[model samples]
Target: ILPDSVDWREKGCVTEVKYQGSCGASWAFSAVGALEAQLKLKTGKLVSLSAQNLVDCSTEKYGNKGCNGGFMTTAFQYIIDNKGIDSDASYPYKAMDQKCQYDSKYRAATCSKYTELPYGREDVLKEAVANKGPVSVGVDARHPSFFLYRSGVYYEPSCTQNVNHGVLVVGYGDLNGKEYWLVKNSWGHNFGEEGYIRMARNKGNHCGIASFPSYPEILQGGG
Candidate 1:
């Protein structure tokens, strides 16, 4: 548990986004993950957003088809042009279901859009962690050991599948009483502390989280 000022339960408010199996939608998730946090922090509304929304809406324009890297930059532009998005509740989940029920009205978005600073390359997470809100990150959690990591202490994975999955940076936590970053994953809530993962704040794996950034202008609210 942490202070109310910053905790997944409180300040780190988030929504459940699907990973769409192991598809290339991970990039969509990473971009939307950060945007989801921005929505909450900027609007104080908590809604389980949609990654497929961005995938379907942002494909071609950004990255390749499913399972291919999508551009978070273009994703934001799409969100801006489209305005607010909806929840999976309204949009429904489509795992490998290419068909879309066009809600042209945009009455309700698959989720909302948000804005923030464009942090890149640098140890952006160091500040993001202290900021206490969900942030998008890329990780090479492709190592066999990464799939086997279970508390105690983090041991570098033998091989890394850099940027395989997209996830949210919720907050900081302590497993086995050791400090770790509280990461929310979309592999269903069954794995890693209820759809969560712990990485050493200083660990290199977080390097994925630091990968390419979403242009702040896309999310830059009225200010």
Candidate 2:
């Protein structure tokens, strides 16, 4: 059992947030964020993977709609089938859709598979994060409150179930007294709490934060 509080940022698994611009590539950011953390736990290394790798390569076959957004699960499958993915230092982030130029020469990390929590199962997700590292999560970031979020616990009673944006579930804790989910966004440091947001938890999986939860299942050293 984990203690009442935990923060992956302080634990050293989470890395500095990167901006995704206005390309709607938040899904790519979330995938890279989770893989970054999972690889750190599996290999004792914190290697940043390329989000653009997915944006370019994870097309029709892997189910990603490119800048239009798609599922993170399909993106993981793309990495596994391709044997590995490139490092951010190698490919970097362009925030815009680009031609597929996946090179094996810049291979950084790979995953054998991935697993998802049962829909709306926040309890299981909490356990997974406490035992594992960070997790990839989909949330309804349509609310302007989410955009204007600066600090304190974020609780939107009108939050919808329509999942649009993707983010990293770095940790969870109580602020003052309310429990929240620590999520890292791709909008850069100018938004939220330094590009991170503490979302209200225990609200029946508020805003589908628990609806589309997933994490990497394995971390391979290299291609």
Candidate 3:
């Protein structure tokens, strides 16, 4: 079953909206945002995970291009293989690539595995967000309006299916009978609604919101 509306932010799982700066490391922020939400749901503690950890270390073998662009699934795989991810307070974000400074001692969250939702399945994506905390998703944010998005149920007819940005789907609900997915972006609070965007939903998977949806399976107990 799924709720008519769901907001992880109200549940105290969603972390503060962050800024990714000039770097195309939205993938790291999206992955870490979902992980932080899952960790909060599992342990009742919302520790901000480090996107910089993935940006710097999830390169090469993990298939992530530091600060250039990356995939959320690959980031999750990096976290799993590396045993855990460090806290943002420890690793921090530099908005640029640097040598991997990940120390296991600073690890604040661990992911045992990850599940990628079937491509283009908004129903499955909705169910995941309703029950599985935050889910990371890829979107076609190449349109000019996306760069200047302010508010309202954002829908760009010019947006294509080519996903170039990664973001977190924190929840979904209807506004004035129009369905929308509440998305958390990595461009800071000055972007959309406090660094969030309510994207049009169920209208042919607008902007490829369901194209690459996925989430990490958090490891319980010790970090």
Candidate 4:
């Protein structure tokens, strides 16, 4: 059963909002964000994982383009295959493509596997966010208003199902009868509500918020 609202940020399961800069590595951030939250929940340790590690290592072999766009699931697969991921403090984000500099010595988190929520099911997505730590999802961020979103339940009537950007869903709740999913972006803290966006929920999967929801499964002592 899901709650009326859920906010991982309030529970200290989320890390600081990050900036993807000119690099289209939002996919990496989304995957890493979910993993970071799961790690915190499992180990009670909030360590910032490296999206730069994914950006640099999850190459075409894993269906990812360094600076270009990629799939969050593929990024998770990279983590699973790599056995673990490094911390941001060690790998650090350069916002641009660089040769793989991942070092196992700096490994900070690991996940045994990942699960992708059913497509187009906001209910399932909500369940995942309520039970799981955080969920990585795809959305149609092509709309100009989406880029300038402030504080409100964002609803783009014309937004297509063509998801072009990756983000994390940290929670959900209703505001004045308007249900919304709290979304975390990789565009820095100034982009939306402190680097978060409340997107319209249960509204025909607005912006395809439920299209490709997924999360890593962190297991203690298992990589």
Ranking by TM-score: 4, 3, 2, 1
Off by over 4 Å in 1: 1-6, 17-19, 97-123, 157-161, 173-177, 204-207, 213-223
Give the alpha carbon lDDT tens digit for every residue of 169-219 in model 4.
999998899999999999999988999999999999889999988999977
Candidate 3 deviant stretches above 4 angstroms = 219-223
> In candidate 4, which residue ranges exceed 4 Å CA deviation?
221-223
**75-111 per-residue lDDT for model 3 (tens digits):** 9999999999999999999999999999999999999
lDDT of 2 at 90: 94
Off by over 4 Å in 2: 219-223
* Model 1 Cα lDDT, one tens digit per residue, 1-223: 3342235556645676355575656666666666666666656776666666765666565544645666665676666767655555666556553644536554333333444434344345545545545666666677666676655434463534256566666776556666566666777666666666776654554435455433222233465
TM per candidate? 0.75, 0.95, 0.97, 0.97
Two-way TM-score contest, 1 vs 2, winner:
2
Better of 1 and 2 by lDDT: 2
Q: 35-97, model 2: which lDDT tens digit per residue? A: 888777777788889999999999899778888897888889998899889999999888789
- Regarding TM-score, does 2 or 3 come out ahead? 3
